[PDB]
C-alpha cells in the first residue's frame, strides 16, 4: 500500500474497532441514530452532497430550529468571491432556540454542569435559571446602547455565566467576539481594538488549576489604549478585591438586579454574523446564524449520538471554537445537558476527569489529544478504579491523535466500550468537518474516517493542483462545495479571507492540512502544510513521525520540525518529552535518542530518522492544546511562556 496509517504497535489486522454494545442500542442504550454500519453512514451522507442535497437540508434547517420567518432559498453564493448564503430569507435567534423554547418544554431540565476550579463548589443550573441570567445581560447591554451589528467582547473564564454572556449577545442581535481569559494586555488590546467594540465583558479574577487569573488588572492595563471601550461589565467570581473604574466599570450583579429577567428577543436574518473568534496580525473569523447553528447541531446529534437525557462533557475552553460549538451553542441547541470545566485535567489531581465523569455520569467526554498525553503521562492508577460506565463516546479533537494515545483513552477512559470519535476541523469551518459517526463507523486509531453531512472532501496534488482520484492517494485536504457553517469572512478584512482559503486552489476550500485517502477509503489528517518536511524529495507529516516516536517506552509527547540540509535539502529534528519515571541519569542520553532514531527508520523509513534529538521538559503549546511547531521551526533555524526559554537554551 502507498498509504500507511499512523504507525501503532498492534498490527493493522487487529486494529479495527466496530461499535461496540453501548452504541449498538443495548445494555439499555439509546439506539444510535446512524447505524449500525458503513453503509448506513453512506446512505445519508450521499443525501447531503451534490447538487440534489437541498431538499434534504431544507428539511433539516425546519427539523432543527425554530424559524420566526421560513427561507425560500436553500442555498447559493460560492468561495470564488466569499458570497456564501444559505436559507438567505429567513429569520431567527440564536438564543431562543437555545434557551427560550426549551425552558418552554422543561424549565427545571438542566442546561450547564458548573464544574467549578474546587470540585465542592460545582452545581447544575438549569434552563430556566441560565435564561433568566442571560436575559438580564442582554437588557443591561441595551442599556448601554448596544445595538444589533454592534460587537461586544467577551474576557471571561470557564464560569458558567460566560454561556449567559455569548447567548446574550445574540439574543439583541450583538456580535461577540471571545478571547481566551489569560491572554495578555497586548494580545487582548489587538482583539478589542479590531471589533471595534464599545462594551466589554469580563471577571474581576479567574480560577483554573487553583491559579488565580488577574482577568481585570490585564483588562485595565489592556483598555489603556482601546478607545472605544466606553462600558465594561465585571462579574464577582472571587469577590478578591480588584481596582475599579470610576462610570466605566460596573459589577455584573448589580447591574442585573435593576432589570426584568425577560428580553424579547431580537430577529436575526440567516445571514446576519452570530460572532467574532480571533485566531492566535490577528485573524477575525466571521460566522452566521442559520448555518453555524445548523452546523453545530447536526454534528452534535450525529458525531456524538447525543439523546435528550444525555449530559455531553466538553471539557475545552470557550475561548476556542470548540467551546462555541460544543460547550454552548451545539449541545444547547439540542436541548441538553451541557458541562462548563473551569478546572484542569489533572487538579487536585490527574483524576479530576474520571472523578467528573463519575460524579455527574457524563454520558459524552470530549477533549484534546494533548490532555488525553497529559493524563497518559501521570500513570493509570488515577482512572484504572472508576466506573465510567455511564460513558457511550469518547472524542479527540485540536490535533492528529497516536494511536498510542488512542488506545490509551481507548482503554482506560472508554474501558474498550466506547466508540472514539476522531472529529478534525477548523475554527473556519464551523462545525465537525471529518470524523466517524460513532453508532456506524469501525474506526482505526488516529483517523478521521468520513467526511460529515455536507462536507465533500478531495485529494489534491499540492503543486499541480489535480484531483488524486480513488483510493491509496495523499496530499493536501480540499472542499468541492461550501457547507452551512463555514465562515463567512474575516472581519473587515475580506481579501485576506479569500487570499487565505479560496485563491490558493481556485475552485475550492483549502484547510491546510495534509491529507492521505488509505486503500479503504478511510481519510488521514497527518498535520499542518506547512509542517512538512522534505527529506530528498520525500514528504514527511508530523503525525507520522510523533507517533512512531511515541512508539518508545517512555515518551510522552513529541514534536519535529524541519530546517535546511545541503545533502538532504531539509532535515529533521526531534522535541522529546519523557515521562516522569524514566531515568535520565542512568540512562544515557545518546543511547535514548539512538534507540528513538531506530524506532523512526523501522516503522517509517531510512529518510524520516532524526538528524538531531533535543529533550525538554515540556513542549511550546496553545491555551488549545496545539503544539506551536512554527516556534520550533524558527528555533532550529536561527500557554506557559517559561517553556521557550529552555527550548532556545537546550538547542543552544
Ligand atoms: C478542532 C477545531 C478547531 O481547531 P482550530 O483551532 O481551528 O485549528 C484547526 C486545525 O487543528 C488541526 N486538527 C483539528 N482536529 C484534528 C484532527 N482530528 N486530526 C488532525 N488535525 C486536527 C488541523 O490542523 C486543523 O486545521
Given at each position: 500500500?502507498?498509504?500507511?496509517?499512523?504507525?501503532?504497535?498492534?498490527?493493522?489486522?487487529?486494529?479495527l474497532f466496530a461499535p461496540p454494545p453501548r452504541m449498538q442500542g443495548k445494555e439499555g442504550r439509546p439506539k444510535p441514530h446512524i447505524g449500525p454500519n458503513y453503509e448506513s453512514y453512506?446512505?445519508?451522507?450521499?443525501?447531503?452532497?451534490?447538487?440534489?442535497?437541498?431538499?434534504?437540508?431544507?428539511?433539516?434547517?425546519?427539523?432543527?430550529?425554530?424559524?420566526?420567518?421560513?427561507?425560500?432559498?436553500?442555498?447559493?453564493?460560492?468561495?470564488?468571491?466569499?458570497?456564501?448564503?444559505?436559507?438567505?430569507?429567513?429569520?431567527?435567534?440564536?438564543?431562543?432556540?437555545?434557551?427560550?423554547?426549551?425552558?418552554?418544554?422543561?424549565?427545571?431540565?438542566?442546561?450547564?454542569?458548573?464544574?467549578?476550579?474546587?470540585?465542592?463548589?460545582?452545581?447544575?443550573?438549569?434552563?430556566?435559571?441560565?435564561?433568566?441570567?442571560?436575559?438580564?445581560?442582554?437588557?443591561?447591554?441595551?442599556?448601554?446602547?448596544?445595538?444589533?451589528?454592534?460587537?461586544?467582547?467577551?474576557?471571561?473564564?470557564?464560569?458558567?455565566?460566560?454561556?449567559?454572556?455569548?447567548?446574550?449577545?445574540?439574543?439583541?442581535?450583538?456580535?461577540?467576539?471571545?478571547?481566551?481569559?489569560?491572554?495578555?494586555?497586548?494580545?487582548?488590546?489587538?482583539?478589542?481594538?479590531?471589533?471595534?467594540?464599545?462594551?466589554?465583558?469580563?471577571?474581576?479574577?479567574?480560577?483554573?488549576?487553583?491559579?488565580?487569573?488577574?482577568?481585570?488588572?490585564?483588562?485595565?492595563?489592556?483598555?489603556?489604549?482601546?478607545?472605544?471601550?466606553?462600558?465594561?461589565?465585571?462579574?464577582?467570581?472571587?469577590?478578591?478585591?480588584?481596582?475599579?473604574?470610576?462610570?466605566?466599570?460596573?459589577?455584573?450583579?448589580?447591574?442585573?438586579?435593576?432589570?426584568?429577567?425577560?428580553?424579547?428577543?431580537?430577529?436575526?436574518?440567516?445571514?446576519?454574523?452570530?460572532?467574532?473568534?480571533?485566531?492566535?496580525?490577528?485573524?477575525?473569523?466571521?460566522?452566521?446564524?442559520?448555518?453555524?447553528?445548523?452546523?453545530?447541531?447536526?454534528?452534535?446529534?450525529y458525531?456524538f449520538d447525543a439523546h435528550?437525557?444525555d449530559?455531553?462533557?466538553?471539557?475545552?475552553?470557550?475561548?476556542?471554537?470548540?467551546?462555541?460549538?460544543?460547550?454552548?451553542?451545539?449541545?444547547?441547541?439540542?436541548?441538553?445537558?451541557?458541562?462548563?470545566?473551569?478546572?484542569?485535567?489533572?487538579?487536585?489531581?490527574?483524576?479530576?476527569?474520571?472523578?467528573?465523569?463519575?460524579?455527574?455520569?457524563?454520558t459524552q467526554?470530549?477533549?484534546?489529544?494533548?490532555?488525553?498525553?497529559?493524563?497518559?503521562?501521570?500513570?493509570?492508577?488515577?482512572?484504572?478504579?472508576?466506573?465510567?460506565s455511564s460513558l457511550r463516546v469518547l472524542?479527540?479533537?485540536?490535533?492528529?491523535?497516536?494511536?498510542?494515545?488512542?488506545?490509551?483513552?481507548?482503554?482506560?477512559?472508554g474501558k474498550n466500550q466506547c466508540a472514539i470519535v476522531?472529529?478534525?476541523?477548523?475554527?473556519?469551518?464551523?462545525?465537525?468537518?471529518?470524523?466517524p459517526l460513532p453508532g456506524a463507523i469501525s474506526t482505526?486509531?488516529?483517523?478521521?474516517?468520513?467526511?460529515?453531512?455536507?462536507?465533500?472532501?478531495?485529494?489534491?496534488?499540492?503543486?499541480?493542483?489535480?484531483?488524486?482520484?480513488?483510493?491509496?492517494?495523499?496530499?493536501?485536504?480540499?472542499?468541492?462545495?461550501?457547507?452551512?457553517?463555514?465562515?463567512?469572512?474575516?472581519?473587515?478584512?475580506?481579501?485576506?479571507?479569500?487570499?487565505?482559503?479560496?485563491?490558493?486552489?481556485?475552485?475550492?476550500?483549502?484547510?491546510?492540512?495534509?491529507?492521505?485517502?488509505?486503500?479503504?477509503?478511510?481519510?488521514?489528517?497527518?498535520?499542518?502544510?506547512?509542517?512538512?518536511?522534505?527529506?530528498?524529495?520525500?514528504?514527511?507529516?508530523?503525525?507520522?513521525?510523533?507517533?512512531?516516536?511515541?512508539?518508545?517506552?517512555?515518551?510522552?509527547?513529541?514534536?519535529?520540525?524541519?530546517?535546511?540540509?545541503?545533502?538532504?535539502?531539509?532535515?529533521?529534528?526531534?522535541?522529546?518529552?519523557?515521562?516522569?519515571?524514566?531515568?535520565?541519569?542512568?540512562?544515557?542520553?545518546?543511547?535514548?535518542?539512538?534507540?528513538?532514531?531506530?524506532?523512526?527508520?523501522?516503522?517509517?523509513?531510512?529518510?524520516?530518522?532524526?538528524?538531531?534529538?533535543?529533550?525538554?521538559?515540556?513542549?511550546?503549546?496553545?491555551?488549545?492544546?496545539?503544539?506551536?511547531?512554527?516556534?520550533?521551526?524558527?528555533?532550529?533555524?536561527?500557554?506557559?511562556?517559561?517553556?521557550?526559554?529552555?527550548?532556545?537554551?537546550?538547542?543552544?
Amino acid at each position: 500500500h502507498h498509504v500507511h496509517p499512523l504507525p501503532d504497535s498492534v498490527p493493522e489486522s487487529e486494529d479495527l474497532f466496530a461499535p461496540p454494545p453501548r452504541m449498538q442500542g443495548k445494555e439499555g442504550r439509546p439506539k444510535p441514530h446512524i447505524g449500525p454500519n458503513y453503509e448506513s453512514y453512506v446512505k445519508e451522507w450521499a443525501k447531503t452532497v451534490g447538487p440534489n442535497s437541498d431538499e434534504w437540508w431544507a428539511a433539516k434547517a425546519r427539523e432543527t430550529l425554530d424559524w420566526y420567518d421560513d427561507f425560500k432559498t436553500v442555498r447559493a453564493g460560492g468561495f470564488e468571491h466569499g458570497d456564501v448564503q444559505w436559507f438567505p430569507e429567513g429569520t431567527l435567534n440564536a438564543a431562543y432556540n437555545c434557551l427560550d423554547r426549551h425552558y418552554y418544554k422543561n424549565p427545571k431540565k438542566t442546561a450547564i454542569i458548573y464544574e467549578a476550579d474546587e470540585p465542592s463548589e460545582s452545581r447544575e443550573v438549569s434552563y430556566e435559571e441560565l435564561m433568566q441570567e442571560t436575559c438580564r445581560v442582554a437588557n443591561v447591554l441595551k442599556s448601554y446602547g448596544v445595538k444589533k451589528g454592534d460587537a461586544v467582547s467577551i474576557y471571561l473564564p470557564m464560569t458558567w455565566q460566560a454561556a449567559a454572556a455569548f447567548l446574550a449577545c445574540a439574543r439583541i442581535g450583538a456580535i461577540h467576539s471571545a478571547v481566551f481569559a489569560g491572554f495578555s494586555a497586548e494580545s487582548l488590546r489587538d482583539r478589542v481594538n479590531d471589533c471595534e467594540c464599545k462594551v466589554l465583558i469580563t471577571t474581576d479574577e479567574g480560577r483554573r488549576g487553583g491559579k488565580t487569573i488577574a482577568t481585570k488588572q490585564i483588562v485595565d492595563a489592556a483598555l489603556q489604549q482601546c478607545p472605544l471601550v466606553e462600558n465594561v461589565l465585571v462579574l464577582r467570581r472571587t469577590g478578591n478585591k480588584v481596582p475599579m473604574t470610576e462610570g466605566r466599570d460596573k459589577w455584573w450583579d448589580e447591574e442585573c438586579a435593576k432589570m426584568p429577567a425577560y428580553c424579547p428577543c431580537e430577529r436575526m436574518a440567516s445571514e446576519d454574523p452570530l460572532f467574532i473568534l480571533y485566531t492566535s496580525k490577528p485573524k477575525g473569523v466571521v460566522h452566521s446564524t442559520a448555518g453555524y447553528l445548523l452546523g453545530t447541531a447536526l454534528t452534535l446529534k450525529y458525531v456524538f449520538d447525543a439523546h435528550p437525557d444525555d449530559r455531553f462533557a466538553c471539557m475545552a475552553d470557550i475561548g476556542w471554537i470548540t467551546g462555541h460549538s460544543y460547550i454552548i451553542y451545539g449541545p444547547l441547541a439540542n436541548g441538553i445537558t451541557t458541562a462548563v470545566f473551569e478546572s484542569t485535567p489533572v487538579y487536585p489531581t490527574p483524576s479530576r476527569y474520571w472523578d467528573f465523569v463519575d460524579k455527574w455520569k457524563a454520558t459524552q467526554l470530549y477533549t484534546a489529544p494533548t490532555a488525553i498525553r497529559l493524563l497518559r503521562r501521570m500513570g493509570e492508577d488515577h482512572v484504572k478504579n472508576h466506573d465510567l460506565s455511564s460513558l457511550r463516546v469518547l472524542g479527540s479533537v485540536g490535533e492528529p491523535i497516536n494511536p498510542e494515545a488512542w488506545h490509551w483513552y481507548n482503554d482506560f477512559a472508554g474501558k474498550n466500550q466506547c466508540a472514539i470519535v476522531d472529529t478534525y476541523w477548523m475554527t473556519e469551518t464551523g462545525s465537525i468537518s471529518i470524523a466517524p459517526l460513532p453508532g456506524a463507523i469501525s474506526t482505526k486509531p488516529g483517523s478521521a474516517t468520513f467526511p460529515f453531512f455536507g462536507m465533500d472532501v478531495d485529494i489534491i496534488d499540492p503543486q499541480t493542483g489535480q484531483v488524486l482520484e480513488g483510493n491509496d492517494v495523499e496530499g493536501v485536504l480540499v472542499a468541492r462545495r461550501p457547507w452551512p457553517s463555514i465562515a463567512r469572512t474575516v472581519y473587515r478584512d475580506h481579501k485576506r479571507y479569500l487570499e487565505t482559503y479560496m485563491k490558493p486552489y481556485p475552485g475550492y476550500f483549502f484547510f491546510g492540512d495534509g491529507a492521505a485517502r488509505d486503500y479503504d477509503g478511510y481519510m488521514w489528517i497527518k498535520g499542518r502544510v506547512d509542517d512538512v518536511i522534505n527529506v530528498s524529495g520525500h514528504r514527511l507529516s508530523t503525525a507520522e513521525v510523533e507517533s512512531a516516536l511515541i512508539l518508545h517506552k517512555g515518551v510522552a509527547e513529541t514534536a519535529v520540525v524541519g530546517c535546511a540540509d545541503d545533502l538532504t535539502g531539509q532535515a529533521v529534528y526531534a522535541f522529546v518529552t519523557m515521562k516522569p519515571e524514566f531515568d535520565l541519569k542512568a540512562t544515557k542520553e545518546a543511547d535514548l535518542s539512538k534507540e528513538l532514531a531506530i524506532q523512526v527508520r523501522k516503522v517509517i523509513g531510512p529518510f524520516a530518522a532524526p538528524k538531531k534529538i533535543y529533550l525538554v521538559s515540556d513542549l511550546p503549546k496553545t491555551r488549545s492544546g496545539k503544539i506551536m511547531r512554527r516556534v520550533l521551526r524558527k528555533i532550529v533555524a536561527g500557554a506557559d511562556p517559561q517553556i521557550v526559554e529552555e527550548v532556545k537554551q537546550k538547542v543552544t
